[PDB]
Amino acid sequence: GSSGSSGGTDGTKPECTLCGVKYSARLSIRDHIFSKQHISKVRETVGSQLDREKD
Ligand SMILES: [Zn+2]
Numbered sequence: 001g002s003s004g005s006s007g008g009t010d011g012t013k014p015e016c017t018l019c020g021v022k023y024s025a026r027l028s029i030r031d032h033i034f035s036k037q038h039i040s041k042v043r044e045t046v047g048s049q050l051d052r053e054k055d
Contacts, residue, residue: 018045 015022016032019041023032032038 018042 013022014027014029016029016038019032019038021032021037023029
């Protein structure tokens with residue numbers, strides 16, 4: 001016989017893979033991104049310091 005295969009994943013749980021800060025059933029993506037906690041990661045992940053030569 002046959003067991004069966006999978007052809008579609010689902011699981012957009014409220015989390016921030018970027019800051020690894022899994023939001024709580026209550027918390028929300030907004031409340032997060034709207035907190036230094038997140039911003040910081042967004043400032044470091046790339047950096048604040050400007051580039052040598054500007055465009
Ligand atoms: Zn975040």
